[PDB]
Design an enzyme around this catalytic site. Structure first.
Site, PDB file in Angstrom:
ATOM      1  N   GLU A   1      -1.927   6.337  14.934  1.00 30.71           N
ATOM      2  CA  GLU A   1      -0.926   5.374  14.486  1.00 30.71           C
ATOM      3  C   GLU A   1      -0.001   4.983  15.632  1.00 30.71           C
ATOM      4  O   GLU A   1      -0.202   5.367  16.784  1.00 30.71           O
ATOM      5  CB  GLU A   1      -0.109   5.942  13.321  1.00 30.71           C
ATOM      6  N   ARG A   2       1.010   4.185  15.297  1.00 30.84           N
ATOM      7  CA  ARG A   2       2.061   3.853  16.245  1.00 30.84           C
ATOM      8  C   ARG A   2       3.194   4.860  16.107  1.00 30.84           C
ATOM      9  O   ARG A   2       3.602   5.201  14.993  1.00 30.84           O
ATOM     10  CB  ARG A   2       2.561   2.430  16.014  1.00 30.84           C
TER      11      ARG A   2
ATOM     12  N   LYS B   1       0.827  -1.190   0.000  1.00 26.54           N
ATOM     13  CA  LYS B   1       0.000   0.000   0.000  1.00 26.54           C
ATOM     14  C   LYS B   1       0.861   1.240   0.000  1.00 26.54           C
ATOM     15  O   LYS B   1       0.505   2.250  -0.609  1.00 26.54           O
ATOM     16  CB  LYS B   1      -0.914  -0.007   1.219  1.00 26.54           C
TER      17      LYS B   1
END
Ligand SMILES: Nc1ncnc2c1ncn2[C@@H]1O[C@H](COP(=O)(O)OP(=O)(O)OP(=O)(O)O)[C@@H](O)[C@H]1O
Ligand SMILES: Nc1ncnc2c1ncn2[C@@H]1O[C@H](COP(=O)(O)OP(=O)(O)O)[C@@H](O)[C@H]1O
Lengths: 364, 314, 284, 52, 52, 157, 73
Positions: free
Chosen positions: F36-37, F10
């Site tokens: 997100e992380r 992706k």
């Protein structure tokens, strides 16, 4: 962690929080207890918390604490059956306080929180006591924020903690904070909005099966119903290497299981899927108190690697003759120094794995 | 803890509990009634008197008619009194029942207090009361207090914090059930979940430990068999199943036992039963040794030999 | 449903009762063709015994080789067994009574010799153990004497050899359509048909050969077509009780449908109940 | 026949006894190992609860 | 030649077999003892550390 | 709607989208994310160098600990952005992170209201917010107002 | 759609001699080719009863489908 499978299913690293569903009066506190084996052995930075606690469990617990070699490897403050619903909410807040002096120290911070429900309905009898409309179960829905603020902290070692500890007198360095969840409910009910949203936040989710230790199989847990995202990435090259076939028998054995559904449906091939599936099923165990060697990592990689798939196939000889291979370690375990030293896949060893299996002939 | 609502033999099981209780009694102790059938207290008390038993034991008596203020009232009396005994008598011991009365009383009180009832109505915080008291009790340096008690299982509602919350405080859980009643077993109760925390496979050995594990299995075994046996009838089974269900009717029945106190409820007294024998016959049916003795002989069995004496006759 | 369960489930019980209803039908046509076919095999065996006596009055004056069948070492035995399923329990009826007879031969203590036919009792007496010098299995619906040949002279040795004095011969049958006759025989008796061996063959039949040969082989014919008939009736019984059990299993699931009717109906009421409960509660 | 089966026999059983001995060597070998272990452990314990 | 060979192989085989059978049995004994011994040493450390 | 598990490339195919939406397509290629992380977001800055084409889209991120309003905020300002790109005729096509964050986000929203929320307390109008949503995204006159549709799986409901 | 599980109050009430009269025997016959198909798999050998029905009703059943944007004369 004290099961070979402990790592095997899902290895991990600092920064992580994985849910493990748990079983009442099953050990899933005593199993949950059975955890710390390698941890006291780890002698590494961790924490744990408890509320509403039971003085007996406290006492005997301590008995184990001394029994636990370390008993100092990590500390916990204690909160008993009178610990305020406030205080109940408080301990999770509390840990970070000097937990920095590891995480900020750039040391791994690590924690354990349990009975979080106590903090919740703590906020309930709070909220109804507050005469304040809460979420369902009379407790406010803050658990999102309450465990947003609460659940946020876990910080794997990283040097944009560049101020962590000395700020940064480097300490320019890697704040490591590994989170220890405790997941349990009667029936393990996820419909709890807590278990719902909370469930979402989980960087791993382990279902514990009451079934194994129920019918008694000491390790009880529910695999693949146990799902943790960290996984055997942390399984080192050999552990990385040899870790594959798990879900296989989870399929295969259980797949083999399906054959019974028609009385007398089986095939010799499938019979081999209960040989690996069911017999290799007979392989695994973890005790009521199980340490795990991880030089046992080799012990694992045997059955495929050694002929231990076939070798000593009798569960009599599996347990017995295998323990007699632990003898063969008594006989020959010179190199395991270099092995647990190593912890990685090298075929050079694997020769010693075959000839090891010869010692297993000698070890029966 | 003693589960079950009343009518379960929560008391009637508790009768033999008084039998073997007495058998092992040998202590400095007292007890009292609460929310209880009146003349039960009358003539039962007249059994204490008949036993001349009230000596070490004063009794308050609560009745089913009582005031809730009375019901929860006798509690703090328990408090101050225990303060007297357990300290004083380093032996302090008692048994009790039907507290779902009291706990429930707190529930009704909450809204009655105008306090927010708890979720679905209890005293909003009432668990505070629970672990407050479960807290408040100990076998003490002051003195060791052995005790046991029951509460109405909320028509055996488990999630009832009566049962639900209850599971917490108790060391060993018990159930007086329609199950062995549904089984018609002399017990008329549900053990199968009950946990003896003291059972260590070290302690138990694998005499008790192992035998127990085999129970966990065989439980799961015939237990499992229930399914497809139900489905097709049991015809489709490998016979080994029939070995399981065999020792199920048989050995399971063997558990059902003569117990002396039966004499009251079951007009006939049964038999005291020693444990070494339990390991013994445990081997026997474990061996399926006799294998001849009917599950019937096993049903309400005396000991292995007594059920084997049966096996001769029965 | 019920809650998510009792109906998904109970519906599976619909798939059940339905499934086994289609079983009642399938195993029904099975039953009809099963006996209908199963009646065929009598004719030439019937002839064989008939004439066998018929001459055998005057003709019987010569010799009987098999008047002992096999000589006495064993009292032999014979097994037929299931190629399919759902028929019935003559594994228990026949295999039970069979094990019983075996006990009777141990009582005798004389030797005995069995041979598996069919798959199941090949796996019973396999399992249950025993002596099957030959094992045959699972011809399906087709009794075939030529198929029996390999088995035919399989046994014909020891019997002919005089090994197994008497023998045991077990054949299911449909005693009625309803009544199903599991049968078990003392085989290797002299079958001993003297009937038309009463009346001296009044038509003096010029005999190209001497009789005793046809005694051996032709006798094999009589008892053999007899066997085709008997196993055939075993199939009559078979698909008969097949249809039967098929129907009853088609029946069982209803009660479940009742209970789940109490989880979806009773827990329906319960769903309604909580609906009221938090309807009020959130409704305050 | 005689030559073969003979050699095989002798070598076979000789090999047999040798093996048995080996098993014994490992037997009281690792077993004795176990006993010594018992002793050392004992020492460590006395130390521990003394420390207590 | 033939019958001879048969018995010879069959024999030296079986002899080996029981030989190892025993060997493993005994080894199991040395284990059994050194186990019991180990237990004893355990008991000893127990008492010592205790009254200590 | 984008349904697929893992190993997408992706980010790779995003470079193909750089190689497309930036390159093989001109129309202004923007994107944004949330929740997100941390250093893995920084590793999406690493990836932002992998594509290196990060210049097509401002970096704006949620980091899910962001409170519910914080979590749910960025979009309409995103329309002050396509108020350039699509409006800039350089067709706004912006990649869309998180539905579960958004679905549950509107849940936490109407919850905080204490209002009769959507069913199971969700944002009552969150769908109407989808009418405003696709209402925003159209191949436009201005420039095609386009969006990469991939959902934080509202539990993959 | 669900075949007659859809149940209209009006129906062939408006249908004509061709429509009411001539067109009558539909839905039950439908249930046939359905029900006629029904047993076929588990208990098999549906004769030209069901063959000549279920299939005839499967054939006509095939003739039923009317695509989107299909009006009917
Ligand atoms: N791995 C295990 N195998 C077998 N038994 C175990 C294991 N872990 C713990 N147990 C048993 O569980 C018992 C204690 O039960 P405990 O109350 O801890 O159950 P629980 O599962 O913890 O319930 P909860 O998790 O809700 O506290 C102990 O007797 C212990 O032997
Ligand atoms: N061990 C037992 N033997 C026979 N009956 C029993 C036993 N235990 C309980 N019961 C039955 O339980 C019934 C209820 O008695 P009671 O003790 O009042 O129940 P509870 O205590 O639940 O009210 C009694 O009628 C009795 O027959």
């Amino acid at each position: 962690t004290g099961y070979k499978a402990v790592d095997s299913m899902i290895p991990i690293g600092r920064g992580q929080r994985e849910l493990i569903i748990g079983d009442r009066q099953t050990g899933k506190t005593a199993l949950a207890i059975d955890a710390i084996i390698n941890q006291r052995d780890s002698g590494i930075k961790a924490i744990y918390v408890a509320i509403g606690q039971k003085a007996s469990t406290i006492s005997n617990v301590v008995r184990k604490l001394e029994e636990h070699g370390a008993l100092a490897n990590t500390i916990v403050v204690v909160a008993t059956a009178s610990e305020s619903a406030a205080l109940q909410y408080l301990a999770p807040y509390a840990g970070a306080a000097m937990g920095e002096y590891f995480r900020d120290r750039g040391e791994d911070a690590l924690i354990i929180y349990d009975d979080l429900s106590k903090q919740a309905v703590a906020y309930r009898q709070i909220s109804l006591l507050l005469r304040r409309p809460p979420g369902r179960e009379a407790f406010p829905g803050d658990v999102f924020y309450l465990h947003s603020r609460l659940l946020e902290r876990a910080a794997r070692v990283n040097a944009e903690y560049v101020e962590a500890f000395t700020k940064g007198e480097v300490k320019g360095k890697t704040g490591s904070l590994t989170a220890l969840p405790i997941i349990e409910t009667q029936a393990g009910d996820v419909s709890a909005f807590v278990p719902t949203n909370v469930i979402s936040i989980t960087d791993g989710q382990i279902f514990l099966e009451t079934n194994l230790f129920n019918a008694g199989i000491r390790p009880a847990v529910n695999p693949g119903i146990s799902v943790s995202r960290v996984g055997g990435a942390a399984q080192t090259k050999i552990m990385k290497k040899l870790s594959g076939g798990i879900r296989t028998a989870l399929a295969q054995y259980r797949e083999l299981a399906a054959f019974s559904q028609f009385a007398s449906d089986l095939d010799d091939a499938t019979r081999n899927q209960l040989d690996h599936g069911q017999k290799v099923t007979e392989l695994l165990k973890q005790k009521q108190y199980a340490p795990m060697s991880v030089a046992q990592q080799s012990l694992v990689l045997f059955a495929a690697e050694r002929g231990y798939l076939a070798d000593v196939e009798l569960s009599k000889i599996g347990s017995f003759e295998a323990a007699l291979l632990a003898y063969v370690d008594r006989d020959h375990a010179p190199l395991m120094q270099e092995i647990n030293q190593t912890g990685g896949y090298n075929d050079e060893i694997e020769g010693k794995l075959k000839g090891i299996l010869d010692s297993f002939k000698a070890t029966q | 803890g003693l589960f079950g609502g009343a009518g379960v033999g929560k008391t009637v099981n508790m009768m033999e509990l008084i039998r073997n209780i007495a058998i092992e009694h040998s202590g400095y102790s007292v007890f009292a009634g609460v929310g209880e059938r009146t003349r039960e207290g009358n003539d039962f008390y007249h059994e204490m008197t008949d036993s001349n038993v009230i000596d070490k034991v004063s009794l308050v008596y609560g009745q089913m008619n009582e005031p809730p203020g009375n019901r929860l009232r006798v509690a703090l009396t328990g408090l101050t009194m225990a303060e007297k005994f357990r300290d004083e008598g380093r032996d302090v011991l008692l048994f009790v029942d039907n507290i779902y009365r009291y706990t429930l009383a707190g529930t009704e009180v909450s809204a009655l207090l105008g306090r927010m009832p708890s979720a679905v109505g209890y005293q909003p915080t009432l668990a505070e009361e629970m672990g407050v008291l479960q807290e408040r009790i100990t076998s003490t340096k002051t003195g060791s207090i052995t005790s046991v008690q029951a509460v109405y299982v909320p028509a055996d509602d488990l999630t009832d914090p009566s049962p639900a919350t209850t599971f917490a405080h108790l060391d060993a859980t018990v159930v007086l059930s329609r199950q062995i009643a549904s089984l018609g077993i002399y017990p008329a109760v549900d053990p199968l979940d009950s946990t003896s925390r003291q059972l260590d496979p070290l302690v138990v050995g694998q005499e008790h430990y192992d035998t127990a594990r085999g129970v966990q299995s065989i439980l799961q075994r015939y237990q499992e068999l229930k399914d497809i046996i139900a489905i097709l009838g049991m015809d489709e089974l490998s016979e080994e199943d029939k070995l399981v269900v065999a020792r199920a009717r048989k050995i399971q029945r063997f558990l059902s036992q003569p117990f002396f106190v039966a004499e009251v409820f079951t007009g006939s007294p049964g038999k005291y039963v020693s444990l070494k024998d339990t390991i013994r016959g445990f081997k026997g049916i474990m061996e399926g040794e006799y294998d001849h003795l009917p599950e019937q002989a096993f049903y309400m069995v005396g000991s292995i030999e007594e059920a084997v004496e049966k096996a001769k006759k029965l | 449903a019920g809650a998510k369960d009792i109906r998904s489930k109970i519906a599976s019980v619909q798939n059940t009762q339905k499934i086994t209803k289609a079983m009642e039908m399938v195993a029904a046509s099975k039953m009809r063709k099963s006996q209908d076919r199963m009646a065929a095999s009598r004719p030439y065996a019937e002839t064989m015994r008939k004439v066998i006596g018929h001459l055998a009055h005057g003709n019987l004056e010569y010799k009987h080789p098999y008047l002992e069948d096999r000589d006495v070492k064993r009292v032999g035995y014979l097994v037929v067994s299931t190629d399919r399923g759902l028929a019935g329990g003559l594994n228990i009826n026949l295999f039970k009574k069979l094990l019983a007879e075996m006990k009777t031969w141990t009582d005798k203590g004389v030797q005995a010799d069995l041979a598996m036919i069919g798959s199941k009792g090949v796996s019973f007496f396999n399992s249950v153990g025993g002596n099957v010098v030959a094992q045959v299995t699972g011809m399906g619906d087709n009794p075939s004497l030529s198929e029996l040949i390999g088995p035919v002279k399989v046994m014909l040795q020891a019997y002919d050899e005089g090994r197994l004095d008497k023998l045991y011969i077990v054949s299911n049958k449909f005693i009625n359509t309803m009544s199903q006759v599991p049968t078990i025989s003392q085989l290797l008796p002299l079958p001993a048909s003297d009937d038309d061996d009463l009346k001296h063959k009044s038509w003096d039949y010029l005999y190209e050969p001497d009789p005793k040969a046809l005694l051996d082989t032709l006798l094999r014919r009589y008892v053999e077509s007899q066997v085709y008939q008997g196993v055939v009736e075993n199939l009559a019984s078979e698909q008969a009780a097949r249809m039967v059990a098929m129907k009853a299993a088609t029946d069982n699931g209803g009660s479940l449908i009742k209970e789940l009717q109490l989880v979806y109906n009773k827990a329906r009421q319960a769903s309604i109940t909580q609906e009221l409960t938090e309807i009020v509660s959130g409704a305050a | 026949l005689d030559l073969a089966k003979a050699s095989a026999t002798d070598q076979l059983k000789k090999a047999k006894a040798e093996a048995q001995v080996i098993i014994e060597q490992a037997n009281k070998r690792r077993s004795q190992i176990l006993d010594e272990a018992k002793a050392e452990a004992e020492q460590e314990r006395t130390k521990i609860v003394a420390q207590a």
